[PDB]
DNA sequence: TCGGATGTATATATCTGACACGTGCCTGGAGACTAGGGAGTAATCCCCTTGGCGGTTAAAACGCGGGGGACAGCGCGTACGTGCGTTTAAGCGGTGCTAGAGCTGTCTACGACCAATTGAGCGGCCTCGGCACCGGGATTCTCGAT
DNA sequence: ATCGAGAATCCCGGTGCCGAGGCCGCTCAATTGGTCGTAGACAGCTCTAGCACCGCTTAAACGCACGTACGCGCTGTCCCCCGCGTTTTAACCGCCAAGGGGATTACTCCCTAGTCTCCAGGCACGTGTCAGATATATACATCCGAT
């Protein structure tokens, strides 16, 4: 039934657009799923064309989905393999939340960057030190995957 | 050569076929015998009723089950899968049946 | 016509919103909890001490929340009524 | 004109957003209330209820919802067959 | 002969309450008739206890409520006190 | 309630007040039965066998059975959690066991 | 009509089929043995609480009453055979 | 070389004195504050008679003492003389106090 | 807050050397802290069920004792 | 044996006839309450209050103290047999427990 | 004001003290825990007696009823003795 | 992975006795009334519970070195599961006998109830001896050295 | 095997304190005497169910052979509790102060026991019929050897 509910969800995101942000299929195949994001200014993420590829288990929404970034991007917890630590995509997980709603979770997280629980060392320490040139790294990193 | 199942698949099978089912396990006749030599050394010349015979079967059956149960616990918990005397004295002395 | 079937489509709601002793537009509608019964807020603060005054059932919590829900169809109805009212 | 009734399905639309299932997302079908007052289906609760041994969490707000915590509501089930025909009057008048 | 006492009667009716078709067997009946009656022992048998503690000599409906409190395990308690209660409001007026 | 009817009736239940009140004087529990207990008792008792009986007849249902035997009595106080706590050294006549093998026993899975 | 060795009519098959309905896989050669003496035990302490009551209404019948009230005062409460 | 008795003969040291004197074990302040913690959950501005505390401290100390005996045994069984938190689960559920 | 802390380690140990253990696995500690809490709150529950019943506003001994035996841990030497 | 005394000696014991009497009575345990039945009560307590009390102090004896405390109690209670199935479950306050290591435990050489 | 009276049986069961060990005095924590268990084997015989004559629709707890009360609930020795002990009362009472 | 052999779930006719329902009646439940005592309410008092210093010091917390126990791996040889042919007695049905459970009637000896009364038992005071404590000394396990 | 140093434990004598055992005054519960309704003992009768027996059918118990999964012992490794010395936190104790509320007394009234009359709620009993057990026959899932 996960079908069924993602059908309803693009047939909701279709009768409502989202905030700046868009998604798809992979394909024909429909248990994978590609999207875009596109910059906030409360954030040092702007004009960064984000890519997500999604994978979700048979019993969505029970189990929680998972997610890839496809850029290496600045963040004090997403990857070079875009995952991100993230409690409610992974244990916190609560069956009545949709794709729309991580995903302006996601961008929230992107709004603010959480160096609490970190994957990539470095990004996270100079995050956790200096934020203008963590601003500046970030905002360059951001240019070079997506102008 | 003929057929021959592993040993261990078939005690499985007969364990879901028991506990599917409700009947009594022990043969009725023997039993009855069993009630009845033990009375006599209480009191001379005891009859019963049928259903009291019954009532004791019921209960002894149901308490055996559960014995067995806790024994079971006691096995695995030394790393065996076959229960031994040791571990039904084990099981009746923490359930407080013997001190 | 003047959207005369919009009206008896929209009465018919307004027939299942009613409290079960204000018996008009319920304000603030609460439920006590334990029962089927919603009231207005007014009306059963009092009577929170001897229970639902229609099923005799007790009071489940002390405080009264107020739901949401229900508080949305009846803004909705308001907006809705007057619109189709053409004002 | 503007064709104005898009407001009034912009309140068709938001009608079906209070009367939705937040789980399954679909008409409310058979309308189940909880302690915390959050309506559910009583299927995707029971498909909710079944795989936890113990107590379970409310899927918006609280924590400990139980079997026998939960009432039939049976308070929108009528009012969802009223939307339908809410809805159905308008194709036909307009 | 002799006359004796059962709630038969009774567990047929609130079945068919809740059930609207299923019957219930014989032997079944019999196991309800016991619950029944063991349940009613412990419930009496706790309010008495508490009306000696207390020095009463009434077996109110408040000193059923408290044994109820005490016998029933937590989700089952909140639901019998609300049943309870609620029968006795509607029986006074 | 102003109804000067059978005191069943004008408490809304189904089990007897009456009878209640009876064996709650001629028992032995106390000197004075106050006339609150026998409805309150009545009540609570007509709950608790609404709950089984429901648990019972799904379990019923399930087997595709119309008629509630002693295994389906059994079912259900145990598969529920607190009706098992309160009937946790009761022993139902015919009443099988819960289907349960321990998780070393079954077959060894790559 | 005295009787002799009836605990050894207590099967070894029957044994076996107690512990299959409680789960248990492999058995020890040596429980069947333990299980007599333990069965033997549990009807005495019955027996003699049944025929106690027997003895106090002057009757030579054990009913199942009889029974079910010596089960419940030792914490093994019957449903089934009345009361 | 200092003096240092070999690991266990202290502990054995141990069993036989406070197996022989009858003084409560826990701290007497911060097992009160623990008993009016939980009682406030179930109902607040509770007070307490000095001896009831003092009755659940006895209870209390009793029911782990209790505990402790019927883990060693389940211990032993296994061929340990360590006790584990495996050993308490095992005991508490033979006992019946979490089926 | 946080008062089941206060049942230290060197307490937990206490008890277990009365009850003839003598080598304690680190991880007992926080095992046996749970399992009393447990049983505290059964216990209290039905003190306090007693005390309100009577209306009053103190726990007694009483309470406690009378708690205790319908549990079935009997307790001798305050009175009942 | 006919007299006008003391119930109690008039039986023998050591222990009221009158006051078992009265708490049978206002006790809820029956309607009425046979002549007989407080005097075969009294006789019962007081037989096995003699022998707790023997037991226990002997136990006291055998520590040099002459004059019985809790621990003495729970020391008789135990060590019999009868009366630890009696009072198997009572817990006596402030009572220790009996002397007991495992086997396994004690050193080897 | 004057406080109300608590019965107990702390005399009694001093006079059979000093009736077995003529020269062992009793402490008072000692004395308490004795007055508890004389009224928890009351109450177990006097309840046990209780259900006893209800299951045979009797209304009477006669001395024959405490008789099987004591069988019931007392191990194999204790319960001789004590069964002794109660006849041998109840005769030299009567007569 | 794969085709056998085997046990299990499923579908269909059919036949029986257990269940659900109608009836007569009779005994227990409901209704009206009276009286008495148990419990609710008000006021008070003084017992004991909470709260707070401040000083001592027993006990908890921390860190460290190491040695003994937890645990995984291997192997060997006996105990036990599976299958089969044979022997035993359980189950069933039917029949005959009567011991004893169960109920009714009658009659009286036993226990409840009540008023007078008087001594056993409880509250309070007090004192001396049993026990707690401490200091010193004898001895007795324990460990490492051979 | 042993023996010697080092802690630990048991024994003994002197001192001091406070609680157990006994005495006294006094209230109130146990005892005595008489009366009276009825629970219970006992004889008699009925007839339900328990016991004994016998013959037949076949399901289950049993004794035996065989092969293999596993219970038990040995070895080796490493890691995690134990013993111990040092420092730091807070329990314990002796004391004082305030006032909440537990316990008690006096009063009043309304709630429940007891009684009588009357009638319908529920139970034994009898009867019809369909839910489920049975028996046959299939499809299908699973186990196991051999690839
Ligand atoms: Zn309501
Ligand atoms: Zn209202
Ligand atoms: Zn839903």
Redesign the interface.
């Known amino acids: 039934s996960a079908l069924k509910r993602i059908n309803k969800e693009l047939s909701d995101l279709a009768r409502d657009p989202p905030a700046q942000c868009s998604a798809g299929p992979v394909g024909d195949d429909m248990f994978h799923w590609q999207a875009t994001i596109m910059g906030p200014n409360d954030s040092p993420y702007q004009g960064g064309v984000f890519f997500l590829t999604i994978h979700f288990p048979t019993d969505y929404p029970f189990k929680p989905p998972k997610v890839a970034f496809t850029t290496r991007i600045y963040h004090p917890n997403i990857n070079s393999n875009g995952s991100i630590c993230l409690d409610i995509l992974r244990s916190q997980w609560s069956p009545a939340l949709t794709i729309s709603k991580v995903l302006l979770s996601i961008c929230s997280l992107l709004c603010d960057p959480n160096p609490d629980d970190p994957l990539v060392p470095e990004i996270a320490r100079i995050y956790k030190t200096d934020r203008d040139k963590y601003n500046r790294i970030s905002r360059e990193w951001t240019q070079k995957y997506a102008m | 050569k003929p057929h021959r199942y592993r040993p261990?698949?078939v005690?499985?099978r007969?364990?879901?076929?028991?506990?599917?089912?409700?009947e009594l396990?022990?043969?009725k006749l023997?039993?009855q015998?069993?009630?009845?030599?033990?009375?006599?050394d209480?009191?001379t010349?005891?009859?019963?009723?049928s259903?009291?015979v019954?009532?004791?079967q019921?209960?002894?059956?149901?308490?055996?089950?559960?014995?067995?149960?806790?024994?079971?616990?006691?096995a695995?918990?030394?790393?065996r899968?076959?229960?031994?005397?040791?571990d039904?004295?084990?099981?009746?002395?923490?359930?407080?049946e013997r001190? | 016509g003047a959207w005369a079937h919009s009206r008896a489509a929209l009465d018919r709601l307004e027939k299942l919103l009613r409290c079960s002793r204000c018996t008009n537009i319920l304000r603030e509608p609460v439920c006590l909890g334990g029962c089927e019964h919603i009231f207005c807020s007014n009306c059963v603060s009092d009577c929170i001490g001897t229970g639902c005054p229609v099923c005799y059932t007790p009071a489940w919590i002390q405080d009264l929340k107020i739901n949401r829900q229900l508080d949305s169809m009846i803004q909705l109805c308001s907006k809705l009524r007057n619109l189709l009212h053409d004002n | 004109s503007a064709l104005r009734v898009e407001e009034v399905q912009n309140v068709i639309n938001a009608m079906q957003k209070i009367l939705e299932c937040p789980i399954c997302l679909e008409l409310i079908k058979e309308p189940v209330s909880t302690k915390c007052d959050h309506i559910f289906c009583k299927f995707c609760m029971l498909k909710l209820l079944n795989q936890k041994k113990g107590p379970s969490q409310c899927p918006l707000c609280k924590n400990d919802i139980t079997k026998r915590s939960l009432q039939e509501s049976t308070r929108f089930s009528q009012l969802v067959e009223e939307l339908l025909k809410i809805i159905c009057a308008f194709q036909l008048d307009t | 002969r002799s006359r004796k006492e059962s709630y038969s009667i009774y567990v047929y009716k609130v079945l068919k309450q809740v059930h609207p078709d299923t019957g219930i067997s014989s032997k079944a009946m019999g196991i309800m008739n016991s619950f029944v009656n063991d349940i009613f022992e412990r419930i009496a048998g706790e309010a008495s206890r508490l009306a000696h503690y207390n020095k009463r000599s009434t077996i109110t409906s408040r000193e059923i409520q408290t044994a109820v409190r005490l016998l029933l395990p937590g989700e089952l308690a909140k639901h019998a006190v609300s049943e309870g209660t609620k029968a006795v409001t509607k029986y006074t007026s | 309630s102003a109804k000067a009817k059978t005191r069943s009736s004008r408490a809304g239940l189904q089990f007897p007040v009456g009878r209640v009140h009876r064996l709650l004087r001629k028992g032995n529990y106390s000197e004075r039965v106050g006339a609150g207990a026998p409805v309150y008792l009545a009540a609570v008792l007509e709950y608790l066998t609404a709950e089984i009986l429901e648990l019972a007849g799904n379990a019923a249902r399930d087997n595709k059975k119309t008629r509630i035997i002693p295994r389906h009595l059994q079912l259900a106080i145990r598969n529920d959690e607190e009706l098992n706590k309160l009937l946790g050294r009761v022993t139902i006549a015919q009443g099988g066991v819960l289907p349960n093998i321990q998780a070393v026993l079954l077959p060894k899975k790559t | 009509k005295v009787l002799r060795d009836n605990i050894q009519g207590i099967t070894k098959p029957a044994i076996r089929r107690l512990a299959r309905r409680g789960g248990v896989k492999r058995i020890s050669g040596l429980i069947y043995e333990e299980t007599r003496g333990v069965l033997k035990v549990f009807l005495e302490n019955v027996i003699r609480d049944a025929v106690t009551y027997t003895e106090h209404a002057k009757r030579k019948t054990v009913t199942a009453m009889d029974v079910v009230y010596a089960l419940k005062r030792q914490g093994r409460t019957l449903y089934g055979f009345g009361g």
Do not use: W
């Open positions: 261990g698949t005690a499985l007969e364990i879901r076929r028991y506990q599917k089912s409700t396990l022990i043969r023997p039993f015998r069993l009630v009845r030599e033990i009375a006599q209480f009191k010349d005891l009859r019963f009723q259903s009291a019954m009532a004791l019921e209960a002894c059956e149901a308490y055996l089950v559960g014995l067995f149960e806790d024994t079971n616990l006691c695995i918990h030394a790393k899968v076959t229960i031994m005397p040791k039904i004295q084990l099981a009746r002395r923490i359930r407080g001190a």
